[PDB]
Paper text:
Addressing the elusive specificity of cysteine cathepsins, which in contrast to caspases and trypsin-like proteases lack strict specificity determining P1 pocket, calls for innovative approaches. Hence, we set out to determine the crystal structures of cathepsin complexes with representative peptides of cleaved substrates. As a working model, [name] was chosen because of the resolution of diffracting crystals (up to 1.3 Å) and crystal packing with accessible active site cleft. Reactive site mutants [name] and C25S of [name] were used in structural studies.
The pattern I group (binding of cleaved peptide fragments to the non-primed side) consisted of structures of six peptides that were cleaved, and only their N-terminal fragments remained bound in the non-primed sites S4–S1. The MPD molecules were bound to the primed site region. Not unexpectedly, the cleaved peptides indicated that both [name] mutants retained their residual proteolytic activity under crystallization conditions as observed previously.
Residue numbers in the entry:
A (entry chain PA): 785 to 788
B (entry chain AA): 1 to 221
The structure:
């Protein structure tokens, strides 16, 4: 998962 | 087992890295675990290459910046015979040509060990006796994005539908009672600016919160  | 464990205090863990806009958390989780096992085997802490995993492990079923799995990464290092250092094969956060060089390899593994699925006490034992452990979690929450301090506990967390790979570097507890207010010490790959210097305390022994013990593994070196 990515940093949003 | 010990009441608390922190492999960072023993030299097993590299500083926090940043996957940036690439779905490569699985690779940082895998390099973190391999970093701690190579440290236990040799006494040298060497940062390993996530880019090497992203560019070269599609045959094992990984998809570079579109996702992957730590066990597939340990399978690649085994099948491949090695893994390059971060210094020699730098991270650029995009899918590129596999440039694996054996002469730059600083790690190897013979396969991996899986922690019994869903068992937090089994993960506790692996963490205490082995070193940092790769784990999958459900990180798909604004509360996780903006985490800063305290034991993270999110009602919307799933223990079965997971979307992020991270590294358990230890566990501990708050207060004087070691049997309550427990937490997993987790290294993330969102930079040291995210969370608490790049880390997060995730509720422990609260029914496998966010799935930390659902898909845990470590490389055999
Ligand atoms: Cl990711
Ligand atoms: Cl995995």
């Amino acid at each position: 998962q990515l940093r949003q | 087992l010990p009441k608390s464990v922190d492999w960072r205090k023993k030299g097993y863990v590299t500083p926090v890295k940043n996957q940036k806009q690439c779905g490569s958390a699985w690779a940082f989780s895998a390099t973190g675990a391999l970093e701690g096992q190579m440290f236990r085997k040799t006494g040298k802490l060497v940062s390993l290459s996530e880019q090497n995993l992203v560019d070269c492990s599609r045959p094992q079923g990984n998809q570079g910046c579109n996702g992957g799995f730590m066990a597939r990464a340990f399978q690649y290092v085994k099948e491949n015979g090695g893994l390059d250092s971060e210094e020699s094969y730098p991270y650029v956060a995009v899918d590129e040509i596999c440039k694996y060089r054996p002469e730059n390899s600083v790690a190897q593994d013979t396969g991996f060990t899986v922690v019994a699925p869903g068992k937090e006490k089994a993960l506790m034992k692996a963490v205490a006796t082995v070193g940092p452990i790769s784990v999958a979690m459900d990180a798909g929450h604004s509360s996780f994005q903006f985490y800063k301090s305290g034991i993270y506990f999110e009602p919307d967390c799933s223990s079965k539908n997971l979307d992020h790979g991270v590294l358990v570097v230890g566990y501990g507890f708050e207060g004087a009672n070691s049997q309550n207010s427990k937490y997993w010490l987790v290294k993330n790959s969102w930079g040291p600016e995210w969370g608490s210097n790049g880390y997060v305390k995730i509720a422990k022994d609260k029914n496998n919160h966010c799935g930390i013990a659902t898909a845990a593994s470590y490389p055999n070196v």
